[PDB]
Amino acid sequence: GLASAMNAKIIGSGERSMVLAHGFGGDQSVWDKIIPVLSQSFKVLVFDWLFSGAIKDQTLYDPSKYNSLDVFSDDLIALMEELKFGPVVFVGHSMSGVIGCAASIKRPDLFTNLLLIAASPRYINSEDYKGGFESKDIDTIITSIGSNYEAWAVDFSSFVVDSRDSLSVQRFEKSLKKMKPETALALAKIVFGSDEREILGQVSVPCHVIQPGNDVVVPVSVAYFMQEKIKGKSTVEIIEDAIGHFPQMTSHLELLGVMRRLLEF
């Protein structure tokens, strides 16, 4: 029953298969600008993660089940199996990047390539690793989500979406505001406090780390960290004029250029 709950759709035709997986607080409409071109060359699976505001039944998401990022890769594989879909080029935005990595370790046979878009294995800074945020900042984000959610959604969307693209800032604000605030909080704990650094060494499927030139959520060094740690073939592609965390919304032709180069279409 995962396909109906997750609003799963396969868009396009032909012998190439792709999955587009949205990130924190989003839904599948984040892909709207690039899905027309991609569907000319790929069968594209899009869906909403069960935390999304787009899920019709907002009571489905249980933080007791969703207590680590690991659980989402199980959902992904189950959905692909239910759809008899694969193997795929998996395109994962943000949290979905490491989710796709984990999925590829669980089922290497389902994943031909991984494209990670502004992905990070860890946001929290330590002595040996720079993720972009101090632990105290992550805690404050979460208490902000849990104190005045709507205000937080306005501030957060303005923080992480290219301020040159007001329409995209508003689209993401809208998506965030559709979330159940308790679900957003539960999710933020496991995403913003994640540590998936150790799984990278197990990734054997070819990987492409696509990184905005200036993203407050992911410092450039994280992209190069992932490339270094990933076992299989791996490249880093910087989109130099990309700002913020949503290049598929705010630098979409640049992103399609990179994808065309990487995937030869």
Secondary structure (H, E, C), the chain: CHHHHCCCEEEECCCCEEEEECCCCCCHHHHCCCHHHHHHHCEEEECCCCCCCCCCCCCCCCCCCCCCCHHHHHHHHHHHHHCCCCCEEEEEECHHHHHHHHHHHHCHHHEEEEEEECCCCCCECCCCCCCCECHHHHHHHHHHHCCCHHHHHHHHHHHHECCCCHHHHHHHHHHHHHCCHHHHHHHHHHHHCCCCHHHHHHCCCCEEEEEEEECCCCCHHHHHHHHHHCCCCEEEEEEEEEEECCHHHHCHHHHHHHHHHHHCC
The residue written with tokens 């709950």 in the block is 5
Cα-based angle 219, 25, 227 (whole degrees, multiple of 5):
30
Return the residues preceding each gap in the chain, C–N over 2.5 A, or none: none
| CA 238 distance to own-chain centroid | 17
Method: X-ray
User: What CA–CA distance (Å, rounded) separates 43 from 221?
Assistant: 33
Cα atoms in the Cβ-side hemisphere of radius 13 Å centred on 225: 21
Q: How many CB atoms lie within 10 A of CB 84?
A: 6
| CA 236 distance to own-chain centroid | 17
Which residues sit opposite 236 in a β-bridge?
A: 209
Which pairs count as long-range contacts for 172-175, CB under 8 Å and 24+ apart, including other chains? 172/25, 172/26, 172/30, 172/246, 172/249, 175/25, 175/26, 175/27, 175/29, 175/30, 175/52, 175/53, 175/54
Full residue range of the structural domain in which residue 211 is found? 1-265
Which residues sit opposite 90 in a β-bridge?
A: 19, 114
The residue written with tokens 């060359």 in the block is 41
**The token pair that represents 236 in the structure block:** 């880093």
User: What CA–CA distance (Å, rounded) separates 229 from 200?
Assistant: 6
CA dihedral for 22, 23, 29, 32, sign (positive or negative): negative
Contact criterion met (CB below 8 Å) for 38 and 19: no
Counting the structural domains of the chain, the total is 1
Q: For the chain, first and last CA: distance in Å?
A: 33
Which residues sit opposite 76 in a β-bridge?
A: none
Of 174, 175, 184, which Cα lies nearest the Cα of 149?
A: 184
Q: Å resolution of this model?
A: 1.5
The residue written with tokens 């508003």 in the block is 170
Positions annotated as catalytic residues are 94, 215, 245
The residue written with tokens 């990595």 in the block is 101
